């Protein structure tokens, strides 16, 4: 299932536990950006997905502050878990930095990450 | 300044506690108990003090004890304090789909939250 | 209709002509970023919208190169025109910069612009 | 390097001409290529990109109306072209449908497409 250790296409490490109540908890270690070591993540997933072959919807957030760095920013990943021989979590993400109002127009980056249980 | 009740532009209500460890926890009501859902997320607990906003994000999975849309929304944005405080966000809403329908699985939009209705 | 001079919430100026064949042409002047004076835009719109009260879908692109500056980037706006007492074009946009592969993960900003024929 | 036929990961095809002035013009279609699947495309690209190894920024729009059908929607692709023997156009896209105001919150889909010169 969702619980386990996942890697995105750039080598970031996503260590997640999916709880009975729909909770996602764990740590994220980024391979890019103003980041170093692990950061806390929390999120939610559908704990009773459809039974028609559909994926399992989920999302989570990392605020890029830990005991060693603070980038004044946060990423959310929104996506779905797809089971099978090679399980996969396909996501799109938004990375918002704290800005002044005049700079808010350039506050948010967008991209897509795919996660598997093997290193890229 | 984040902890409390917030209201978006379309009649939703966003109730949150910002914990000392960077946690966001609370409930989201998209319109009674049938419409309330758990939310969890994170925020920058040590933001800059130069006029910049406070970065944050949270997730709602659209399942409760009454309904299940097989979908989840993430909001990514920043809190801005002051007399007219706001949380300005962009969001992604992914539905569980088959592989053939995955290309149309994700909606995008934006929400602005205020402390007054 | 769509043809006219529009302004977004930051004061950018969008001068557009909607042709009978579905073509959008005109110029864009940005209130923000590495930009000066007018830039070419081209795009498309639905020349036969639904008759059920729905808006009119459209989109356009600006490459941020003109005779004065070149930011090595391009924005696309995707949205719909909504007729009314206060006509409005509501959009969401993607701004992609030319980058190296190592920097591609942070190549794309995302936002939302609303345009009116009155400058806010 | 942009002018020619490109294929995405899901069976769509587009033929584009990159003009000297920065114009993109052409047609977007399905793998089958039947007339009912073909739509006009129009966009812009950076006609003087950097020389430091960066990609070439571009974007284009397709409104999903042709002589045969009308989905009352339009997609914009925003991305960069990367040349070489394994040339690519890497994009993210937004697909907005015309909606009433009550339904505008769910008017816009987002995704990503990768285009290659080979099927």
Swiss-Prot record, chain B:
MF terms (GO), sorted A to Z:
biotin binding
- The segment(s) forming the Avidin-like domain are 1-117
Q: Which UniProt keywords apply?
A: Biotin, Secreted, Signal
**Motif Cell attachment site: where in chain:** 42-44
Q: Where does biotin bind?
A: 28, 37, 75, 91, 103
Q: Does the keyword Endoplasmic reticulum apply?
A: no
The entry's cellular-component GO terms read: extracellular region
Give compartment(s).
Secreted
Instruction: Note the SS bond partners.
Output: none
**UniProt main location, coarse:** secreted
Q: Which family does it belong to?
A: Belongs to the avidin/streptavidin family.
Describe, as the record does, how this protein assembles with itself and its partners. Answer: Homotetramer.
Summarizing the function annotation, the protein's role is:
The biological function of streptavidin is not known. Forms a strong non-covalent specific complex with biotin (one molecule of biotin per subunit of streptavidin).
Listed name of the protein: Streptavidin
Organism this protein belongs to: Streptomyces avidinii
| Residues included from the entire protein | 40 to 158 of 183
């Amino acid at each position: 299932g969702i619980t386990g250790t996942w890697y995105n296409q750039l080598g970031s490490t996503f260590i997640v536990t999916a709880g009975a109540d729909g909770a996602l908890t764990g740590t994220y270690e980024s391979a890019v950006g103003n980041a170093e070591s692990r950061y806390v993540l929390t999120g939610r997933y559908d704990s009773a997905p459809a039974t028609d072959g559909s994926g399992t919807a989920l999302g989570w957030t990392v605020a890029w502050k830990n005991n060693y760095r603070n980038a004044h920013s946060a990423t959310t990943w929104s996506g779905q878990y797809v089971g099978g021989a090679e399980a996969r979590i396909n996501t799109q993400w938004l990375l918002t930095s704290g800005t002044t109002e005049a700079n808010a127009w350039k506050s948010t980056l967008v991209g897509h990450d795919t996660f598997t249980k093997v290193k890229p």
